[PDB]
Design a binder for this molecule. Sequence first.
Ligand SMILES: [Zn+2]
Ligand SMILES: [Zn+2]
Ligand SMILES: [Zn+2]
Lengths: 205, 205, 205
Amino acid sequence: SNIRENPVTPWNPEPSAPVIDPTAYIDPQASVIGEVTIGANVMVSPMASIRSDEGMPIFVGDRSNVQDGVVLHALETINEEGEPIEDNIVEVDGKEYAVYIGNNVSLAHQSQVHGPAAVGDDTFIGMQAFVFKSKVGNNCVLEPRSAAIGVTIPDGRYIPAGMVVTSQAEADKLPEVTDDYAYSHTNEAVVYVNVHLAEGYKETS
Amino acid sequence: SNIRENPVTPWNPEPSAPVIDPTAYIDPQASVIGEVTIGANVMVSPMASIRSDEGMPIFVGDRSNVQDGVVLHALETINEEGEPIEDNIVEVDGKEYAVYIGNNVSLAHQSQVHGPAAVGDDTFIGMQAFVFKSKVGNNCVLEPRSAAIGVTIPDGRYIPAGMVVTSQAEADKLPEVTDDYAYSHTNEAVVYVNVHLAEGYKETS
Amino acid sequence: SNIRENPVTPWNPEPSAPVIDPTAYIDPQASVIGEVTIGANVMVSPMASIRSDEGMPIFVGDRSNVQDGVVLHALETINEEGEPIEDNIVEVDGKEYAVYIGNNVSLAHQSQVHGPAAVGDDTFIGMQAFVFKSKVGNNCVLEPRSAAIGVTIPDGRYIPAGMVVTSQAEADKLPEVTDDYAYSHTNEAVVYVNVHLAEGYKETS
Ligand SMILES: [Zn+2]
Ligand SMILES: [Zn+2]
Ligand SMILES: [Zn+2]
């Protein structure tokens, strides 16, 4: 099966299986392993790998999409001695996650979000982009081939294509999404399409 | 099955199945979905995802290759009201495509060509490279990790490794492929190898 | 089967099947083809593609890991006339390889090592990184999105995130890994985790 439990390890005494909303579509050629929660109307495309086998949950919110070849994974959140590694855990609305993906988020083809990381609602993570040890705000756009490592990206900012942002001083001065910006409406269109694709693919299974 | 029809959606009243030349080899661990035409002697490697589920055809020409982890997908070409979105359609030799890949084209490992896009004959798209909203000419080389977004790349030019080209002014001044250039003969070698691999893998199926 | 022989071609008269240590774990959604040797306690994750179909062996040493979406492949090492192409072969400890990955090496998610290439022991190849026509020394760190093309990386150096190194003059002046460097202990942690994951996943098969 392509939806599987995680294994017993010294930081994982009890295997967990994914919790998947009945309205989500998981492609047969995707892989979803371990302590993962997937929300309503989510589309998970071929060759995506969502792997939660190092402690703590990976959460994917409602009406989000995980496109072809995307990888979600996380650094260890609990060491062998049972002690939580707080640097590798993100907090969102009072709860702890290894990776938190909000609602109406698009993770476009071949992107990767590696824990610890959080991605806020209505954000487009572009093709081949990379997020690691970062919190990306709501209503952001990461253009194709951009990256955020070790930073907080404020709400409503974008990262231009190819830019690798590794310092908070850079992140603070990123440009703002405006109506005339080329990707200002991209995420809403992609979410609309993917919610409809999920329903159509479900009707073929 | 890994060769599948696309689903019924508001922009796709009628499902389409891929049209695949009998001399092409599609690896069992590749995914090919929807309105796709694959030409003669094409090799599609493990973990490639060719997904035509947003309207209009993805075409892969004769003697081309689609290597491991490559993704082909496209933006919507027909909106819900049946109206064609002309910005997201490319025209090649009088016909309309979401993605057009010409003859003798190599799409090397982990690259991505996202529609609207066209790639001309005898072009090497290097490892991890990215093409989106662009027309790449014939006899071009995109070196590994290069990208073309929103531009036309003239025939016989190359993009150096790691360069992300987003303006036409940049694209117009790209260097020319010459006989002494390091990748000048790369595509011909890769095409020769892949046509022979396709035949060898077909003999094991 | 996802563990397969390579095909008969003009440079490969005799098919070879992978040689895999009984303590290694190969995920069912990985692909391993051809003349490949995998060492003890190696973890190969979903969507990895290890493909040795152009002559010469791809070797993955003991306690190494090949994470999700990683690709290993190599340029042709033997031409049609049976003549070895020496430029495309690396030598390590008196033996010839297309790709050599040493012991305790982490190939992180979506990275790629393309032959000819060698990666020395205790090296971290970061997420989305790229190695081609290069020898990477022991105890190195390639940060996420870095690349080494056509160069030798001395022992104990790192490449900062996003940097594409294509000249030996650049490679010679790369910074050194020190105890206070952010990724100085990353590889040891990742190797420890992956050796334990391999054993846990083996207990579920
Ligand atoms: Zn990871
Ligand atoms: Zn797409
Ligand atoms: Zn290759």
